[PDB]
Amino acid sequence: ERRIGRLSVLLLLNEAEESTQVEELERDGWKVCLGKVGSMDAHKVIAAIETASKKSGVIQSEGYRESHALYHATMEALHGVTRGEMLLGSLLRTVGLRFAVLRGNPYESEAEGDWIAVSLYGTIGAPIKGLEHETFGVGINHI
Amino acid sequence: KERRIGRLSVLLLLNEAEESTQVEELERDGWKVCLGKVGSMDAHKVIAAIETASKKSGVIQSEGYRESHALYHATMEALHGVTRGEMLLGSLLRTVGLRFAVLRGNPYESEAEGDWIAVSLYGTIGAPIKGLEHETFGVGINHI
Amino acid sequence: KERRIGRLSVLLLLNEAEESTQVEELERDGWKVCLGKVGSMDAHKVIAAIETASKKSGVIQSEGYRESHALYHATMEALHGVTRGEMLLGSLLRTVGLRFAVLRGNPYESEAEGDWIAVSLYGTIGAPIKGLEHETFGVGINHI
Amino acid sequence: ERRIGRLSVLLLLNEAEESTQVEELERDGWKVCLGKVGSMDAHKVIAAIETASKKSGVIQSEGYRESHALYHATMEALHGVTRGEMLLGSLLRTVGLRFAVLRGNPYESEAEGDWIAVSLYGTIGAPIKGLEHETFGVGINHI
Amino acid sequence: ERRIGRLSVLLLLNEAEESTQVEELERDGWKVCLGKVGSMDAHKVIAAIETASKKSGVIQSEGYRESHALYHATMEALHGVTRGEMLLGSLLRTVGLRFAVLRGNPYESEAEGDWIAVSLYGTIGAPIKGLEHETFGVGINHI
Amino acid sequence: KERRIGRLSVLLLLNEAEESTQVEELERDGWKVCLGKVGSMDAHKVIAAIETASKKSGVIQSEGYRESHALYHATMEALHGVTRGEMLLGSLLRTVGLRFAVLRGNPYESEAEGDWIAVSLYGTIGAPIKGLEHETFGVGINHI
């Protein structure tokens, strides 16, 4: 099972001692990343994600090529967590976002290069009501 | 995590190993599970199929257009996620195999307003180039 | 409100009761009215139709591509409004019945630069689910 | 005639003693709203519209479900009044926007829920020239 | 060769004593414009372009009709220089943009009106690496 | 300007006068040139064609899916530029004639990491109205 798309989502959604899931994928030649953000605002998210990605070894500190792939992978997922009008993710206060990044060779490293994916699991809660909605998103790019 | 129809619904779509075990576990908790596949990525062939699989199996009953509607929208939105932008320009005998999941129930916390319907799809897309496939993923969640 | 081709044009499309009364009232004021229907939501079958209905009835004359052009763009833009995003993924024997209105004249205030052309459409969309229809609405306004 | 789409536009465009048209639709189980704004900027409009909607009884003060439907209904109409690039509605100074909101059961309340629509009639005037352009927009959503 | 699309791009890309190319097209009933900007941010670009266009005789100082056509022509090209998510052109620092505007009658002025085009040639360089990427864009509108 | 595959690639697409002179000039500098035409604006008929013309002429070799892939993406992106938005709603026997250029080599400065592939297209679009054509232009640049 080398689906860089299916894996990430599964990673994002699995709160089953994630520490192990990670090491399992790292040990399987993968670059993993996990995080959270209190906003569905394009900029917030990207900046937040750009850092968690550079700190962990997911992407080089200075490389346009990889940042485009990442940014792009994120924009895709971002159009999903926000139901359609990405701009609307700005207006939503009291929200939360679980992101998961994964980077590696999807085709068993046979005459192929690296790819990248960004899973976004967003929930919209209210002060009284706990959670009012759930949103999913997945961006998948090649480097 | 606790009782989140969308997450549940996805975790169900994504793991296709001992489905009966994960599905009976699901119904056992006041839930309505229905899965299927679609060899098409056409709005009509998908809604038609899902429309039937959902209905054929007690997920939603057939009488008023209401339940039929709350599913439609869930489907539509999840479908809008499947077909996005890179997919926009891929409509020539594209080998499309869509696996789907539908889940009906109430993410009951306390309030218990009414029930929800959560439709999520996950298929693959064959590209014109050899040895290349694209993953698609969509989720529509609507209150019935 | 006073002499606004777009508003006029819309108020004309929307009210289909005693059209001859509202249309003669319109021409009587140095205007050019032309209405029709289209059972298609294809760019070509719409422009072709509108192209003819407009021309067949003295809205625009047939000689240079100019007038034919100023209409095209009006149409195109109003058509871009009809087909938007939710509509994007609805292209399977979708029962589409489009009613349209074209209005040619000058929203003369004082300046009187030249004439305008205002094309607005308003059809319906049948969804795959039963008992469900979607309204579409578009308006293209261009100076000839 | 229960077309929540056709009605609203007709409402927006009719300056025929609107007070009566309203009461007519209210009396016919409809939630009406009317307004104006001097900007075609996404945020302006939405915020402006969000208020006129909550003050009148069109939407609950605290409910994510209805605000999404509203916001969405608006975004649709907003892509229209602005000819295509919604971002461009920001650059346009000296403009004006007449909005009309309507909420109720389009299918005679038979085993069905509420829907919503947002009509936007925008005009672009200049200091010398009165009005240089007219723009129309309609967003229609289900709650 | 009256392709207002092909010309502009050719103009943009040709660093062959551009002064002559211009005069050649001006002398051939064309309104030309050339420029540069250090940002792929929608607003930057448009404002930057709006000025170079009004100063040179490409567009009237006060006219909604021509500014829409221009703005639109730019938005098109702008979605190209930025690979897909125009918003992402904001995040890119250390960039550069060569723009070329052209306005005139594409169909030999026979019973036809003016059109407009905006070529955008953008390069993404880094402090060490010279240039990491090249982007092209073309917006074409009718006035 | 100096050795910029994209600019080169475009300047090549755009000028169709003494191509052999501009192409031999190109190869003479450690480059790989390949041009062609496509009477289609379908994702598959374009990639298929380009796939072959590129491969048929030593631009990219046929063995691993890698090179086939780095071209695909270049193509796809340049194709996404050709089909944009106004084009979105123009899919009825639209007379589409696409001229394309592919260029493979290294925009070698000093670093010489690896080679690049630059695909750019430039066709025309016939509109339903008479005497009307639309220019399309796209460029995809990817590192192999």
Side-chain angles (χ1 to χ4, degrees), chain A residues 2-143, chain B residues 2-144, chain C residues 2-144, chain D residues 2-143, chain E residues 2-143, chain F residues 2-144:
Chain A
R2 204 79 178 174
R3 292 298 187 68
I4 175 176
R6 191 175 158 294
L7 287 149
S8 58
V9 178
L10 258 203
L11 187 64
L12 185 54
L13 257 52
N14 273 180
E15 313 303 320
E17 38 173 341
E18 64 198 8
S19 290
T20 62
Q21 329 189 187
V22 177
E23 203 156 55
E24 199 187 306
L25 302 154
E26 284 186 292
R27 183 164 175 293
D28 193 14
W30 288 102
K31 260 65 170 200
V32 184
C33 178
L34 283 164
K36 296 207 71 304
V37 271
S39 175
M40 302 206 148
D41 177 55
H43 291 58
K44 292 308 189 304
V45 178
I46 297 170
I49 292 184
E50 193 189 357
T51 331
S53 304
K54 296 183 182 302
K55 184 193 300 177
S56 59
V58 192
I59 188 176
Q60 282 44 293
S61 268
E62 306 197 301
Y64 159 70
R65 191 173 160 192
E66 313 195 306
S67 304
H68 168 69
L70 171 61
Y71 286 10
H72 190 303
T74 312
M75 285 286 80
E76 281 190 15
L78 237 195
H79 280 54
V81 294
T82 71
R83 301 214 248 176
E85 263 304 280
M86 185 171 73
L87 170 146
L88 277 55
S90 314
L91 319 149
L92 292 166
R93 305 176 189 78
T94 156
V95 68
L97 196 94
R98 195 181 214 283
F99 67 72
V101 193
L102 200 62
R103 175 252 254 284
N105 222 290
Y107 293 120
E108 184 158 56
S109 180
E110 67 178 330
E112 185 204 15
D114 289 351
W115 279 69
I116 199 168
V118 169
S119 313
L120 261 28
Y121 171 46
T123 61
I124 290 65
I128 152 148
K129 174 64 204 67
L131 175 169
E132 201 140 356
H133 218 79
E134 279 179 290
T135 65
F136 296 98
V138 181
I140 300 177
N141 254 261
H142 66 284
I143 305 290
Chain B
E2 190 160 355
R3 186 183 192 74
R4 300 183 177 169
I5 174 178
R7 177 171 163 296
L8 291 171
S9 175
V10 166
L11 292 173
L12 177 67
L13 196 59
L14 293 184
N15 198 59
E16 74 280 322
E18 283 54 89
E19 328 171 75
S20 60
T21 86
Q22 204 172 175
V23 174
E24 279 173 50
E25 161 200 357
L26 230 52
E27 295 190 320
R28 188 164 289 160
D29 203 354
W31 280 120
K32 300 301 196 54
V33 200
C34 157
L35 311 188
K37 212 199 93 52
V38 192
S40 180
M41 199 145 285
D42 192 281
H44 183 53
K45 305 189 96 179
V46 178
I47 184 84
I50 288 169
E51 181 191 63
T52 316
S54 293
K55 183 178 303 178
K56 192 180 192 178
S57 155
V59 174
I60 57 174
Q61 44 174 181
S62 56
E63 70 293 319
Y65 298 160
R66 184 168 172 191
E67 274 180 3
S68 185
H69 281 36
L71 171 52
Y72 177 71
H73 297 154
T75 307
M76 225 56 251
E77 174 179 351
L79 186 46
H80 264 69
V82 190
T83 58
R84 187 189 300 153
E86 196 192 313
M87 200 290 318
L88 291 175
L89 42 49
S91 319
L92 186 165
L93 288 180
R94 272 220 182 190
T95 182
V96 301
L98 264 194
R99 177 167 163 60
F100 78 83
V102 184
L103 183 49
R104 187 276 179 66
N106 178 196
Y108 176 63
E109 79 266 4
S110 57
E111 188 166 359
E113 293 183 299
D115 275 358
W116 268 261
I117 193 74
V119 169
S120 63
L121 323 152
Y122 166 49
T124 192
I125 303 182
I129 274 297
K130 190 181 185 181
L132 188 65
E133 324 176 22
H134 290 288
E135 291 189 60
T136 49
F137 182 63
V139 182
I141 305 180
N142 182 298
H143 178 305
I144 295 174
Chain C
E2 190 160 355
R3 186 183 192 74
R4 300 183 177 169
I5 174 178
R7 177 171 163 296
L8 291 171
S9 175
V10 166
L11 292 173
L12 177 67
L13 196 59
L14 293 184
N15 198 59
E16 74 280 322
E18 283 54 89
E19 328 171 75
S20 60
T21 86
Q22 204 172 175
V23 174
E24 279 173 50
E25 161 200 357
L26 230 52
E27 295 190 320
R28 188 164 289 160
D29 203 354
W31 280 120
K32 300 301 196 54
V33 200
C34 157
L35 311 188
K37 212 199 93 52
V38 192
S40 180
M41 199 145 285
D42 192 281
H44 183 53
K45 305 189 96 179
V46 178
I47 184 84
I50 288 169
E51 181 191 63
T52 316
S54 293
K55 183 178 303 178
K56 192 180 192 178
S57 155
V59 174
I60 57 174
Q61 44 174 181
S62 56
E63 70 293 319
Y65 298 160
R66 184 168 172 191
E67 274 180 3
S68 185
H69 281 36
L71 171 52
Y72 177 71
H73 297 154
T75 307
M76 225 56 251
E77 174 179 351
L79 186 46
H80 264 69
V82 190
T83 58
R84 187 189 300 153
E86 196 192 313
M87 200 290 318
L88 291 175
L89 42 49
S91 319
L92 186 165
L93 288 180
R94 272 220 182 190
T95 182
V96 301
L98 264 194
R99 177 167 163 60
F100 78 83
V102 184
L103 183 49
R104 187 276 179 66
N106 178 196
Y108 176 63
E109 79 266 4
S110 57
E111 188 166 359
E113 293 183 299
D115 275 358
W116 268 261
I117 193 74
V119 169
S120 63
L121 323 152
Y122 166 49
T124 192
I125 303 182
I129 274 297
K130 190 181 185 181
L132 188 65
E133 324 176 22
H134 290 288
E135 291 189 60
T136 49
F137 182 63
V139 182
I141 305 180
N142 182 298
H143 178 305
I144 295 174
Chain D
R2 204 79 178 174
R3 292 298 187 68
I4 175 176
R6 191 175 158 294
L7 287 149
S8 58
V9 178
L10 258 203
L11 187 64
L12 185 54
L13 257 52
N14 273 180
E15 313 303 320
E17 38 173 341
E18 64 198 8
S19 290
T20 62
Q21 329 189 187
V22 177
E23 203 156 55
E24 199 187 306
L25 302 154
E26 284 186 292
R27 183 164 175 293
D28 193 14
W30 288 102
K31 260 65 170 200
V32 184
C33 178
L34 283 164
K36 296 207 71 304
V37 271
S39 175
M40 302 206 148
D41 177 55
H43 291 58
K44 292 308 189 304
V45 178
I46 297 170
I49 292 184
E50 193 189 357
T51 331
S53 304
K54 296 183 182 302
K55 184 193 300 177
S56 59
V58 192
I59 188 176
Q60 282 44 293
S61 268
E62 306 197 301
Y64 159 70
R65 191 173 160 192
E66 313 195 306
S67 304
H68 168 69
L70 171 61
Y71 286 10
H72 190 303
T74 312
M75 285 286 80
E76 281 190 15
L78 237 195
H79 280 54
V81 294
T82 71
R83 301 214 248 176
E85 263 304 280
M86 185 171 73
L87 170 146
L88 277 55
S90 314
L91 319 149
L92 292 166
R93 305 176 189 78
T94 156
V95 68
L97 196 94
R98 195 181 214 283
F99 67 72
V101 193
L102 200 62
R103 175 252 254 284
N105 222 290
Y107 293 120
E108 184 158 56
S109 180
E110 67 178 330
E112 185 204 15
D114 289 351
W115 279 69
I116 199 168
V118 169
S119 313
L120 261 28
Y121 171 46
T123 61
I124 290 65
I128 152 148
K129 174 64 204 67
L131 175 169
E132 201 140 356
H133 218 79
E134 279 179 290
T135 65
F136 296 98
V138 181
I140 300 177
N141 254 261
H142 66 284
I143 305 290
Chain E
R2 204 79 178 174
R3 292 298 187 68
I4 175 176
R6 191 175 158 294
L7 287 149
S8 58
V9 178
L10 258 203
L11 187 64
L12 185 54
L13 257 52
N14 273 180
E15 313 303 320
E17 38 173 341
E18 64 198 8
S19 290
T20 62
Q21 329 189 187
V22 177
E23 203 156 55
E24 199 187 306
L25 302 154
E26 284 186 292
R27 183 164 175 293
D28 193 14
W30 288 102
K31 260 65 170 200
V32 184
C33 178
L34 283 164
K36 296 207 71 304
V37 271
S39 175
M40 302 206 148
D41 177 55
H43 291 58
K44 292 308 189 304
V45 178
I46 297 170
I49 292 184
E50 193 189 357
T51 331
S53 304
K54 296 183 182 302
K55 184 193 300 177
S56 59
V58 192
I59 188 176
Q60 282 44 293
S61 268
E62 306 197 301
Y64 159 70
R65 191 173 160 192
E66 313 195 306
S67 304
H68 168 69
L70 171 61
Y71 286 10
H72 190 303
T74 312
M75 285 286 80
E76 281 190 15
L78 237 195
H79 280 54
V81 294
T82 71
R83 301 214 248 176
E85 263 304 280
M86 185 171 73
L87 170 146
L88 277 55
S90 314
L91 319 149
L92 292 166
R93 305 176 189 78
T94 156
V95 68
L97 196 94
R98 195 181 214 283
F99 67 72
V101 193
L102 200 62
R103 175 252 254 284
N105 222 290
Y107 293 120
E108 184 158 56
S109 180
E110 67 178 330
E112 185 204 15
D114 289 351
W115 279 69
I116 199 168
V118 169
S119 313
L120 261 28
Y121 171 46
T123 61
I124 290 65
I128 152 148
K129 174 64 204 67
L131 175 169
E132 201 140 356
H133 218 79
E134 279 179 290
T135 65
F136 296 98
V138 181
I140 300 177
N141 254 261
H142 66 284
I143 305 290
Chain F
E2 190 160 355
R3 186 183 192 74
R4 300 183 177 169
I5 174 178
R7 177 171 163 296
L8 291 171
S9 175
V10 166
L11 292 173
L12 177 67
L13 196 59
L14 293 184
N15 198 59
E16 74 280 322
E18 283 54 89
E19 328 171 75
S20 60
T21 86
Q22 204 172 175
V23 174
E24 279 173 50
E25 161 200 357
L26 230 52
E27 295 190 320
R28 188 164 289 160
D29 203 354
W31 280 120
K32 300 301 196 54
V33 200
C34 157
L35 311 188
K37 212 199 93 52
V38 192
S40 180
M41 199 145 285
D42 192 281
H44 183 53
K45 305 189 96 179
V46 178
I47 184 84
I50 288 169
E51 181 191 63
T52 316
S54 293
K55 183 178 303 178
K56 192 180 192 178
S57 155
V59 174
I60 57 174
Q61 44 174 181
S62 56
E63 70 293 319
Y65 298 160
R66 184 168 172 191
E67 274 180 3
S68 185
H69 281 36
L71 171 52
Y72 177 71
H73 297 154
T75 307
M76 225 56 251
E77 174 179 351
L79 186 46
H80 264 69
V82 190
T83 58
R84 187 189 300 153
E86 196 192 313
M87 200 290 318
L88 291 175
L89 42 49
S91 319
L92 186 165
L93 288 180
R94 272 220 182 190
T95 182
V96 301
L98 264 194
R99 177 167 163 60
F100 78 83
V102 184
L103 183 49
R104 187 276 179 66
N106 178 196
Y108 176 63
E109 79 266 4
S110 57
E111 188 166 359
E113 293 183 299
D115 275 358
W116 268 261
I117 193 74
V119 169
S120 63
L121 323 152
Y122 166 49
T124 192
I125 303 182
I129 274 297
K130 190 181 185 181
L132 188 65
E133 324 176 22
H134 290 288
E135 291 189 60
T136 49
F137 182 63
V139 182
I141 305 180
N142 182 298
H143 178 305
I144 295 174

